[PDB]
């Protein structure tokens, strides 16, 4: 009876723990990917700048 209140909260506790663990794994994977993508975007923007300047220098020579 008094044991029943406690058991039911405990069961609920274990499901919440499970989903929190799963969400944390996914969330952390997602953060890593955002950080990677922002850096990659930055590198590409720099690369694009350098090639665009190289076009104008080739047009100047030509």
């Amino acid at each position: 009876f008094m044991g029943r209140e406690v058991e039911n909260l405990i069961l609920e506790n274990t499901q919440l723990l499970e989903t929190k663990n799963a969400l944390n794994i996914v969330k952390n994977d997602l953060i890593a990917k955002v950080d990677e993508l922002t850096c990659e975007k930055d590198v590409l923007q720099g690369e694009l700048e350098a090639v665009k300047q190289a076009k104008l220098k080739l047009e100047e020579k030509n």
């Binding site: 799963a22 969400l23 794994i25 996914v26 994977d29 990917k33």
Partner: protein, 161 residues
Amino acid sequence: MEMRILMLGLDAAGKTTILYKLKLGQSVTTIPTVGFNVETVTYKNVKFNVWDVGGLDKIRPLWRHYYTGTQGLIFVVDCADRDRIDEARQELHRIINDREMRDAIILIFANKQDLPDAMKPHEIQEKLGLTRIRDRNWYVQPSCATSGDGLYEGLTWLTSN
């Protein structure tokens, strides 16, 4: 035109092979995916954001956390794996009946068609329990990922639907 694609299926089915054959134009070496891959593939003026999520049994419970905003599901099946085609059916119907996935267009890649005794589309259709589903847009497309056979026909259907 933008479409968010979630690409699921059991481990070893060919998901990552398909993703990078489409993105990089060649069959690259793959290991079982921990986490996910995501790339934008443009074909027919439509820009597909394709999420490729690891299909190992251990990490399949994680798939549901990637459903948000999905407009099309690609479910990849290893057609030479008869021992797991029913496991694949169970996983498919799990996915499509989720609230976040109920409006999603369904493309099946009947993959690994190159192998000797591999199941045909209409058999894959039957084995995956799609036949009697009249309420959802679905299609079974035969494919070979490592050669790129069938892959762009798959995307054509997604663009069409």
